Amino acid sequence: LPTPVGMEIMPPQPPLPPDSSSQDCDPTASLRPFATKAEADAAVADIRARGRLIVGLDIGSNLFSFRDPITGEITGFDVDIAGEVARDIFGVPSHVEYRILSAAERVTALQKSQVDIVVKTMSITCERRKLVNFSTVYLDANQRILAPRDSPITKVSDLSGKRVCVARGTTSLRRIREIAPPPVIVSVVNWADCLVALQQREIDAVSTDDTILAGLVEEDPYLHIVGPDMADQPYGVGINLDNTGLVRFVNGTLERIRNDGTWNTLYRKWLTVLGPAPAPPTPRYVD
Ligand SMILES: NC(=O)C[C@H](N)C(=O)O
């Protein structure tokens, strides 16, 4: 039996209070794109000279960034979003190199300038905005619960005292830490590890973005998604705090794909399990 390396039963801790200052900073507002093509091209000249866009992501999130078992290629919604940025830089999307990063390493790789962008289901938060920059929102998810079809778990309070899996370094862990009385919290490196743990009955439920959970359901249709929206998860492209030019550039790409049909095509390609495509998230700008 496969045992995913890195599984930890976390020490019992008192519930954290829900923090109401979380929206103080208006986290989803970002920087307006450049008005001229020449300004935008200048802002990515260093990337262009390096010959490829270096993108941080992983292979642990089915539907978002994973290795296709048939073609062997890294693919998914997040891969395709990153490829549209590369298309804007290079003219075609294929000039991308990946740096494999866990959820807990997304901020550090940006701080250390180890990638140009992170496209890895990265929720935009005020705490993260103290450390990195973000594009406007490219997909809006919400934290829910995944359990086997025969499980009685249907609401948040059912998680108390039960074994709930979360990946380390995620907003999902922070939300589960609010539950009173606490679940038994089992943490792992990536969300695919939570699926293995549930398949082996080493946990009782998984809680994270409904988008990610839908990817797990696609791999294991014995599971289903239950419960209310537990916490908004607005995804942004993560960028080094000081590279404001790249923020504006990526926001230009997002304006393009929201309006030229590409975003709709990518949603239909990857996410129809969640329902018919909504309108793309409306961008918000500070300036
Ligand atoms: N694994 C994830 O990305 C979960 C959540 N979107 C986060 O930003 O932490």
Numbering used by the authors: 42 to 328
Sentences from the study reporting this entry:
The conserved aspartate-specific solute-binding protein (SBP) GlnH links extracellular amino acid concentration to PknG activity via the periplasmic transmembrane protein GlnX, thereby controlling glutamate metabolism in Mycobacterium spp. GlnH belongs to the solute-binding protein family, specifically the polar amino acid binding family, which bind to arginine, cysteine, histidine, glutamine, glutamate, and aspartate. The fold of GlnH is related to bacterial solute-binding proteins from ATP transporters and to the sensor domains of glutamate receptors: two lobes close around the Asp ligand in a Venus flytrap-like arrangement. We propose that the amino acid concentration in the periplasm is sensed by GlnH and that protein-protein interaction allows transmission of this information across the membrane via GlnX to activate PknG.
To determine the structural basis of discrimination between higher- and lower-affinity ligands, GlnH was crystallized in the presence of Glu and Asn. Overall, the structures with different ligands bound were similar. The greatest difference is in loops 99 to 103 and 109 to 113 (DIGSN and DPITG, respectively), which are displaced 2 Å in the Glu- or Asn-bound structures compared to the Asp-bound structure. The conformations of the ligand binding site and positioning of the ligands are similar. Asn is unable to form a hydrogen bond with Trp 232, providing an explanation for the difference in affinity of binding. Addition of aspartate, glutamate, or asparagine increased the thermal stability of GlnH, suggesting that these are ligands for GlnH. Our structures of liganded GlnH represent “closed” conformations.
